[PDB]
Structure formats: C-alpha cells, structure tokens
C-alpha cells in the first residue's frame, strides 16, 4: 500500500506505517478559500469514522486515495 506524503510543499507519495494504511485529509474550509482551495493536510491513518464532521478528518480505506490535485485534461 501507498499513501500521499504529509504535504510539506511538493505533493509526492510515501508508504503507510505497519498499523496505518488509509489516507486522511484534515480541512477547515471544505468549499473554496480561494488561491489553494482548502487547508487539506494529508497523512496516513488506521481508522475512518463518519458522522457529519462540519470540519474534521476524512479518509478512504485504500492507497493514495487522498490525491488533492487529480487534475487531468481530456
């Protein structure tokens, strides 16, 4: 399994720990704060709850499943 880096500056890719595997993203805008969308702090996690965060830590039980860019032409 892989999971995107902490996002220090260059959004790259890194392995997850022996416990953690799923990719998380922490955001306090969830919309469009202009310039750089939302804060979005990447990182690997082990749990994935869900109950209307309003601003909390989301995730996906997979590899690099937090790709914040995902910008591809067609």
């Amino acid at each position: 399994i892989v999971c995107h880096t902490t996002a220090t500056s260059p959004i790259s890719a890194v392995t997850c720990p022996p416990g953690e595997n799923l990719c998380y993203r922490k955001m306090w805008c969830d919309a469009f704060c202009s310039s750089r969308g939302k804060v979005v702090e990447l990182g690997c996690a082990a749990t994935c709850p869900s109950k209307k965060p309003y601003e909390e830590v989301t995730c996906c039980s997979t590899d690099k499943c937090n790709p914040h860019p995902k910008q591809r032409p067609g």
Partner: peptide, 19 residues
C-alpha cells in the same frame, strides 16, 4: 521584528497559509 505564526499547508502552494 516579523513574529511569524505556526503556518500550515494548503492545497499545494498557498505560501505560509496565514496571509
């Protein structure tokens, strides 16, 4: 004397987040 916060990350490249 720039105090400077504990600036976090943004989408990719918002510089030091605060300002």
């Amino acid at each position: 004397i720039p105090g400077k916060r504990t600036e976090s990350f943004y989408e990719c490249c918002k510089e030091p987040y605060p300002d």
